[PDB]
Amino acid sequence: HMRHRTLSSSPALWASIPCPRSELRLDLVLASGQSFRWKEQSPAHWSGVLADQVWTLTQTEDQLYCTVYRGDDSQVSRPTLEELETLHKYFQLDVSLAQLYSHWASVDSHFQRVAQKFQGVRLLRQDPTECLFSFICSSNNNIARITGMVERLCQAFGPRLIQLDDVTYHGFPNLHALAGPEAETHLRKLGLGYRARYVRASAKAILEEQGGPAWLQQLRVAPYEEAHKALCTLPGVGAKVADCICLMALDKPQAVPVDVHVWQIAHRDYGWHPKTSQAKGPSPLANKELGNFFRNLWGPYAGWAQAVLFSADLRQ
Ligand SMILES: COc1ncc(Nc2nc(N)nc3[nH]ncc23)cc1Cl
Ligand code: NI
């Protein structure tokens, strides 16, 4: 049995990245339903899989500490340099949150009030595959049910990596694994309900119709609007999910996912009503309008601004 590390447990095996808590609060970013793979196994100690390796992460007021578990009896070492660049990109630490917060606040007094208690909210840069199928599971769910669905999906279809304590960590499947004949049947047995069709179908579609997972990398370089359009061709992927994926895995920071929660915020908190739309409630067109509303207000990181409000909408 190998054990989940704390910073006490084994300070030999931790490395560190200079990170102000104001640029990144793990506790706000790892649970909040960007990823559904990180758990707080021990207090202030976040463990989950990234690119077929397990990590535990923790931080101070100016340091981000991390440790790696490779799997098959390699010899426990501290994170390498390459392994630390991986983790730097995932947090997109090149991006100054302080600068964006100040810009947003300058045009949005609502944001000024809210954002003081929610510093260090940034977007993860996720693997498009994992993001896509995670958000295909997102329809008509809460975060807890999705967390479960993804885990069970990974344990049943994904490579085993390592076991720590009672937790067996699997990597995310490849498209072939998800597009198999018995897939939906199995996924349905794992509690995914209707979504099981969309997972299998989208997997099968990305292979055949789109020419493998390279297609998703293309969308990452493709401009926002083309990426969105492209994603909406997939089974179970509509505007909202496409915008999630755009924002969280295809480097489109201006993507603003609109559902009924954001309708509610926009109306209550910003006094927004659909103008160029007739009908007084959600619709593909009115949603699209609301997205443009926020882009026009917050600028080309509108999605990142939104993420701060979202993170204030799960903390009462
Ligand atoms: C602005 O940045 C963000 N946008 C969306 C999410 N996550 C979700 N949104 C919605 N409407 N439903 C969800 N179900 N499960 C997750 C999730 C998170 C952020 Cl930070
Ligand atoms: Ni009103």
Coordinates of all heavy atoms in Angstrom, one line a residue, residues 33 36 137-149 195:
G33 N -15.9 22.6 -10.5 CA -16.6 22.1 -11.7 C -16.0 22.7 -13.0 O -16.8 22.9 -13.9
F36 N -13.4 17.7 -12.7 CA -14.1 16.8 -11.7 C -13.2 15.7 -11.3 O -13.8 14.6 -10.9 CB -15.4 16.3 -12.4 CG -16.3 17.4 -13.0 CD1 -15.9 17.8 -14.3 CD2 -17.3 18.0 -12.4 CE1 -16.7 18.8 -15.0 CE2 -18.1 19.0 -13.0 CZ -17.8 19.3 -14.3
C137 N -21.2 14.8 -19.8 CA -21.9 14.2 -18.6 C -22.5 15.4 -17.8 O -23.2 15.1 -16.8 CB -20.9 13.5 -17.8 SG -20.2 12.0 -18.6
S138 N -22.4 16.6 -18.3 CA -22.8 17.7 -17.4 C -24.3 18.0 -17.4 O -24.8 18.6 -16.5 CB -22.0 19.0 -17.7 OG -22.7 19.8 -18.6
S139 N -24.9 17.7 -18.6 CA -26.3 18.0 -18.7 C -27.1 17.4 -17.5 O -26.9 16.3 -17.0 CB -26.8 17.4 -20.0 OG -26.6 16.0 -20.0
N140 N -28.1 18.3 -17.0 CA -29.0 17.9 -16.0 C -28.4 17.1 -14.9 O -28.8 16.0 -14.5 CB -30.2 17.0 -16.6 CG -30.9 17.8 -17.7 OD1 -31.5 18.8 -17.4 ND2 -30.9 17.2 -18.9
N141 N -27.3 17.7 -14.3 CA -26.6 17.2 -13.2 C -26.2 18.3 -12.2 O -26.3 19.5 -12.5 CB -25.4 16.4 -13.6 CG -25.6 14.9 -13.7 OD1 -26.0 14.3 -12.8 ND2 -25.2 14.4 -14.8
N142 N -25.8 17.9 -11.1 CA -25.0 18.7 -10.2 C -23.5 18.2 -10.2 O -23.2 17.2 -10.9 CB -25.5 18.7 -8.8 CG -25.3 17.4 -8.0 OD1 -24.2 17.1 -7.6 ND2 -26.3 16.5 -8.0
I143 N -22.6 18.9 -9.6 CA -21.2 18.6 -9.6 C -20.9 17.2 -9.1 O -20.0 16.5 -9.6 CB -20.4 19.7 -8.9 CG1 -20.6 21.0 -9.8 CG2 -19.0 19.3 -8.6 CD1 -20.0 22.2 -9.1
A144 N -21.6 16.8 -8.0 CA -21.3 15.6 -7.3 C -21.6 14.4 -8.1 O -20.8 13.4 -8.2 CB -22.1 15.6 -6.0
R145 N -22.7 14.3 -8.8 CA -23.1 13.2 -9.7 C -22.1 13.1 -10.8 O -21.9 12.0 -11.3 CB -24.5 13.4 -10.2 CG -25.6 12.9 -9.2 CD -27.0 12.9 -9.7 NE -27.2 12.0 -10.8 CZ -28.2 11.9 -11.6 NH1 -29.4 12.4 -11.3 NH2 -28.2 11.2 -12.8
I146 N -21.6 14.2 -11.3 CA -20.7 14.2 -12.5 C -19.3 13.7 -12.1 O -18.7 12.9 -12.8 CB -20.6 15.7 -13.0 CG1 -21.9 16.2 -13.6 CG2 -19.5 15.7 -14.1 CD1 -22.0 17.7 -13.9
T147 N -18.9 14.1 -10.9 CA -17.6 13.7 -10.3 C -17.6 12.2 -10.3 O -16.6 11.5 -10.6 CB -17.4 14.3 -8.9 OG1 -17.8 15.7 -9.0 CG2 -16.0 14.1 -8.4
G148 N -18.8 11.6 -9.8 CA -18.9 10.1 -9.7 C -18.9 9.5 -11.1 O -18.1 8.6 -11.4
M149 N -19.7 10.0 -12.0 CA -19.8 9.5 -13.4 C -18.5 9.5 -14.1 O -18.2 8.4 -14.7 CB -20.8 10.3 -14.2 CG -22.2 10.0 -14.0 SD -23.3 11.1 -14.8 CE -24.8 10.9 -13.8
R195 N -26.9 10.0 -21.2 CA -25.6 10.6 -21.6 C -24.7 9.5 -22.2 O -23.9 9.9 -23.1 CB -24.9 11.1 -20.4 CG -25.6 12.3 -19.7 CD -25.1 12.3 -18.2 NE -26.0 13.2 -17.5 CZ -27.1 12.8 -17.0 NH1 -27.3 11.6 -16.6 NH2 -28.1 13.7 -16.7

